[PDB]
Ligand binder design. Structure first.
Ligand SMILES: CC(C)(N)CC(=O)N[C@@H]1COc2ccccc2N(Cc2ccc(-c3ccccc3-c3nnn[nH]3)cc2)C1=O
Length: 365
């Protein structure tokens, strides 16, 4: 009987704090929740390491998708702050000490969610310390150095560990979150360290597994919804042919909506060319790359650990992790060094590549 007009989700994970301890769990947690929600037919946007401005802009764009009957899920994992009975999401650029004005107020987002006529609105916070059918989950796990454990790096946070084991169930969201709360209560490590409070104003039997009804996008909501659904689409693979005859294959992969991996490999070397090597350079300055971190022999050397299963071997890898900062088309240079058989000189050739505005860059931020 219950139907969703559409299913949208925004997941934010903050790890690389400029003035606060770096977190490791949001990377794996946001990555695993993204896949789980996509299996439930949600159109997901996942963003890693956002500033105060970037966080406010992403939340505003997500709030704009919440039309009548739509199911929306917002997930935040990172540093949290509590002050005067209010809770705040701490962006990566927050100065030390914490100031409320530099953070996103959770209660204020809840207030904006209450004004929507959503079929379901799930807001989950995983922090380190008229009806809209709002189900609010508030997990607090202040620590990492407070447990004594030498963690895996690719290890899951406490909330996500139990959440991922139950999210795919066809059960009312409030009943499902109550089971996660019970699971955490059974875990002895959690005692006095983790906490979870569920607040709910859900007056009807709604679940994340509910089917999508007559979607029927309105006039002004059309572009917004198509753009959100397409921020998961990668640029297609390309084969670049150089003047000397050498062919380079350029491939693309994604960890998050703002993290893309570019890989290159020499697919054809004419017999006249004795030796050649290709590399990528001159990326837009807003991305803050540094050649000492690009063109690596393995994806792990670039800071990429999550999509090694989908990455072809024997390539050179580059990780672009600040795609949300891209204001224009992604234009870069593919450089080729080559030598003719019987010649001593090394020749240099280069061509520019324009892959448009990929993933999160499609959104009008
Ligand atoms: C908001 C958040 C992150 N969902 C809250 C949360 O769940 N916090 C818990 C607290 O510590 C745990 C206690 C029990 C089980 C799992 C965890 N993990 C997982 C984890 C912890 C540390 C590291 C790590 C590994 C190498 C180097 C540095 C760190 C590091 N140092 N500090 N943070 N990461 C990796 C994963 C948590 O992150």
């Amino acid at each position: 009987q219950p139907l969703a007009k559409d299913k949208v989700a925004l997941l934010i994970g903050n790890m690389n704090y400029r003035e606060h301890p770096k977190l490791k769990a949001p990377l794996v947690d946001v990555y695993e929740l993204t896949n789980l929600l996509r299996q439930l037919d949600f159109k997901v946007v996942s963003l890693l390491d956002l500033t105060e401005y970037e966080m406010r802009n992403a939340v505003d764009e997500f709030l704009l998708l919440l039309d009548k009957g739509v199911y929306g899920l917002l997930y935040y994992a990172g540093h949290g702050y509590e002050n005067f009975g209010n809770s705040f999401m701490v962006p990566v650029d927050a100065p030390n000490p914490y100031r409320s004005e530099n953070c996103l107020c959770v209660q204020n987002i809840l207030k904006l969610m209450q004004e929507k006529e959503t079929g379901l609105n799930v807001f989950l916070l995983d922090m380190c310390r008229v009806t809209a059918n709002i189900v609010f989950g508030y997990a607090t796990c202040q620590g990492a150095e407070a447990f004594e454990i030498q963690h895996s790096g690719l290890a899951n946070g406490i909330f996500m560990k139990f959440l991922k084991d139950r999210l795919l169930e066809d059960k009312k969201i409030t009943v499902l979150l109550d089971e996660v709360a019970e699971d955490m209560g059974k875990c002895h490590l959690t005692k006095g360290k983790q906490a979870l409070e569920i607040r709910s104003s859900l007056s009807e039997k709604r679940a994340l597994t509910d089917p999508i009804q007559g979607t029927e996008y309105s006039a002004e909501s059309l572009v917004r919804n198509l753009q959100w659904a397409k921020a998961h689409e990668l640029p297609e693979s390309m084969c670049l042919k150089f003047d000397c005859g050498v062919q380079i294959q350029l491939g693309f992969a994604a960890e998050f909506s703002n993290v893309m991996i570019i890989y290159t490999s020499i697919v054809y070397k004419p017999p006249e060319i004795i030796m050649c090597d290709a590399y990528v350079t001159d990326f837009p300055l807003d991305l803050d790359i540094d050649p000492k971190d690009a063109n690596k022999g393995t994806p792990e050397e670039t800071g990429s650990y999550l999509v090694s299963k989908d990455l072809p071997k024997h390539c050179l890898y580059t990780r672009l992790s600040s795609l949300q900062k891209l204001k224009e088309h992604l234009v870069f240079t593919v450089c080729l060094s080559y030598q003719y058989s019987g010649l001593e000189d090394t020749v240099e050739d280069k061509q520019e590549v324009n892959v448009g505005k990929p993933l999160i860059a499609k959104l009008d931020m």
